[model samples]
Target: KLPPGPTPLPIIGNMLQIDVKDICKSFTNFSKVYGPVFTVYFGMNPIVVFHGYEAVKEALIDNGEEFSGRGNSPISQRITKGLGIISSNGKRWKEIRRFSLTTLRNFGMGKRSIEDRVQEEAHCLVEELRKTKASPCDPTFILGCAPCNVICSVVFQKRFDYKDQNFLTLMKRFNENFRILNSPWIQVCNNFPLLIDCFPGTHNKVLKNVALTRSYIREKVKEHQASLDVNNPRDFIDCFLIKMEQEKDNQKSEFNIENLVGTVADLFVAGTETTSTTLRYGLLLLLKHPEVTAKVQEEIDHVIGRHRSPCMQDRSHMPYTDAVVHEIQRYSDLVPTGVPHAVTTDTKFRNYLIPKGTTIMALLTSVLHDDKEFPNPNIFDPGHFLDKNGNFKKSDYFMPFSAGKRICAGEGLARMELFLFLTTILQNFNLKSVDDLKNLNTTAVTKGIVSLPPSYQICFIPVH
Candidate 1:
């Protein structure tokens, strides 16, 4: 009746029916049985599990207004304080998102300067890898440092030295804090928010992490506020502070220090986790599929050659490499179900009424994994993005960043970071594991939302 799923047990509902480990596997099996738009209950709440391109597209793109609001959980709202771009909806979302977008653009996120920053970080990553001396190092530190530093550079106008303990602590805390969003405990808390908040549980640890990240951001806010020049804003925080001061009298305005802190946190979390995780997976997949790796490197060599360092602009010439990156994003499918949205108005589709408060998701993984669109959906083949003439072709179904009103605000910046960083690293380093385990594990080992491939390190074998 309820879109046809495995029958749920009483009280637990479908909780036991779901596999906390390997969610992609569980969702794949579920979609095969239940039609694309099936219903599943998480406790008392009825969650509509949308699968495949057609259903997600119909709901997200066509019926957008019905799915624009973000049904952020109470726990998330408490941490973000509804001031950041991710947790806030309606006018708050619009104003903050617009301002953030404008700020990122003004800071050269789309320009060559950002590309240079990414390339520089990749170089720094290689320098750090040099210390490993091919002794299998967890690429985790490099991965986190690279993107986090890039975001820091853009927002704070400074990058960290590898030995900087404060930056390292911030990065470590941020990674630890990612658990508050996707961990099983957080999921449980969302279901019984009032009870969980009142009583003691793992949410307490999450609260501590929340406070740590907040204090960290507050310190940075204070530092920037002291040194910032209003005549010439240096970075994202400066731009934001200047704007907040200008909009001080406007009660309806969303610009404030709390919002600034929250916005920086949003940028840090989203910007760091999503791009870095995908690139980590990108390398693992490439290493696992050596033939594909050779083909991609060959294309890069043929197109760009070794003379000039690869830049975002070079994506146009390196068709195979570009296709490989796109296919990797499609296959990786990190932004699953995207950033959720809430329905603003009652909407009828196929005579079924969706209430105004209904949550509509874009099922990002389904679109990227559609078989009709990409042959051999299970395999990581770059050919999915290749035409008959072998030229790279873009697919409408490749929705890694989602689309419509709530599409990823940092899509351009993320794309620039991923492509530029990955290409630069692969060009310099012979990526390999330092563990006695020569082969890297590609299975999803991460908690939720963001999935990390197994822990592996890369050796930057410089081409002298």
Candidate 2:
């Protein structure tokens, strides 16, 4: 039996009714009509989606472990190989996640070392944009490249330049594959799997992208195998390889080549896309709300200033800018449903039974857009995150990265990157759209796991 939902036809169930273009819009509308917790069918399967603060918290935090595991989504299972933190569970998930977090931290995530790398990338970002000669430019590629390089530096102990042929190819394949994988045909392949992979279609690109990623990581692993010195580990792979060797005799160890590759790939994919897109929207929102933008820039000027390059610590002093960045993340409701999380066991919430492995979202968007929680949820108001004194503030409901034990491992790094990049860009240059574009179309498409704002161009005018 299913929870309350729209009736569906046979075979397709409610699949035909689903709007793949902007799934969040549909989810939001459904929640409005059906209340916070309700069901929808994907063909024959029943999925219960939880929305708003209470419902999401009941599942994700109050009953966390019961919903910590990721159930079998054929597409996710096939693509991730059940190896990385994104797709693993039980003992395997815990070990790899811890290892990944430890390695990232040691490599300078919170320390001066990684901050140096991110700051270096930010400088290159501003310099590269200036070379556009203040002409209209698509900041997507340039914006995303820095985070890619930062993860690369952490995992591979080096960064690639814009023109590196091999690096460029890998990035191109990844972005292209993401576009196609979300297409309906690929969804068909993911659902039916057997039939579509045999034919030529978007599925081919998805498979190729998987292969390209695995193959590239294989090469890196091999290089690490050859040059790795047990006394000293250079990168993520080197550290992981050494751990694998040291613990190979330990039957409990989960450190192996497959998990290592997938973990690194997950870092690269998840890390770059979210950061770049958030920054893109952050800039776009600045253009649309000039007064808010001016206040933020002024805060940056006063707190971080034009002379000193922005750092993660400066955010403590820059309350207004910080609140705006946090509010941008909240109001935009990017990654609305977030990565799908499933029940690890049978659970109960609010006298309702949530059976184990029921697919659900922590429902970040619903809370971010809740009418009572946010006075005018639809408007881009920074006051939503501010107090009467205009000090930086946050609500428990502001979860851009979903909560609980399986929360984003890179939360600290993402905050640092967003603050440093946003403050730096605003301090040095005014972000304005090309052709005097008035308002950005808030409408967005789900580009794979992350919701993407449309293709928009803007000019970076030097502020100083």
Candidate 3:
């Protein structure tokens, strides 16, 4: 039997009752009434939602193979054309994921070898912050730009200046796409796309931005193709180009220009927004809780002084700073409900029978905020990751980057970015809110695909 859920309407499903803005919260509430394994409809499609750590773990971890399929949402299908890693399944996903992982590691994804690149970017970031001269400035663009360059370096074999007009324009377009992609209207359109596509909305805006992004990538690919040297691959594009040439005669191979463009787009789109938003939102948390911020600063100073930048090795020695970073990711609850997963086959999950091709959502927010694991789960306390002796305390339930076979591909890079960026900033400068800290809003500005902190300026006063 399928898991029980609230009655979905004829065509609209649970659209009226479920608010797209607070999808995590809505699913959590539903789980209380319908139990952990439950179903909700999107149009006529029955979507099974796995809530809490127990249920989510069982499906994503225990039954990994069955739950490994990517959901075929209309919006994702329309945007990606079922080609890239984010939307692709079976052989395509397997080949791309394996190739991408190996390529990223060779370029120093999780290893200490990548420390130089992050430190270089951190230095650049500090210089950018220094320009404000302790003045209040919006950090959204710069934060987004830094991580984008990290991915750019790995993918395109180059980085763009923060002031470059072309890069800035590209960033603006991508940011607009992220906002529109997370809007309520777009959520509805995902179900009734044909009906909604008749008129203009965020969907139209998304297509245009997608075009601009892919066009830039295509140009990069063309340049890489021109400078092709199969023996020596500079970056991801070069690696993919080499693969395409090797499989030139094989019609069965997924390696092609289309997949190349789509894969690069997926990396850029996924890599940029999530990490940058976490750092941006994290700064707000620091501003609101100056005491917590101070403790982190103190830890950084003790472990790695202001003379040199913070490194991955420093993280092991600095427990408080590590705890703070972990807490920031946990409390931020970035991707509340992770990218939806699909059933690979008709399988029995506990009491429920989930059919093949059915859309399944695993509530990451529910697991991160599980009261059983995190005491006072709603509160943003670094103690969540700290032991009584002030040592870094790790928990199995701490899964900001969702767990299992389909976990975030950029987890290693993102973790490195978050630590280096946050530590480097606090080491050189102290973040002060423009308004009084007491009156500051710490709540997320948007809560769609990723939860974003509200737009606010902060003074980055250089430390003596």
Best by TM-score: 3
Badly placed stretches (over 4 Å) of model 3 are 106-113
Q: Which segments of model 2 are wrong by more than 4 Å?
A: 8-10, 106-112, 184-189, 192-199, 229-232, 437-440, 446-449
Q: Name the candidate that leads on lDDT.
A: 3
* CA RMSD, predictions in order: 2.9, 2.4, 2.0
Each model's C-alpha lDDT?
A: 0.75, 0.77, 0.85
Residue-pair clashes per candidate: 2, 1, 0
- Ranking of predictions according to lDDT: 3, 2, 1
lDDT of 2 by residue, 148-248 (tens): 77777778767888778977887877777666654545444544557564766666667888898889989989998998787767777877887899899
TM-score of each: 0.91, 0.92, 0.95
TM-score of 1: 0.91
Better model by lDDT: candidate 1 vs candidate 2? 2
**Candidate 1 positional error at 233, Å:** 2.5
Name the candidate, 1 or 3, with the larger TM-score value. Answer: 3
Number of the candidate with higher TM-score, 2 or 3: 3
The residue-by-residue lDDT of candidate 3 on 1-464, one tens digit each, is 67999998888888777878787778888988999899998777788999999999999999998999998887788789998798999989999888887777735332224456667788789889989899998998878888888777777775778888878888888788887777766667777777565657655777888888899989999999999877778778888888889889999999999999999989988889898999998888898889998988888988898787888889999888888889899988998888889989898988778899999899988889989789999889999998999999999898888888888888888889999999999999998888888788878754567788878899999998
Where model 1 places Cα greater than 4 Å from the true spot, the runs are 1-12, 22-30, 106-112, 194-201, 433-440
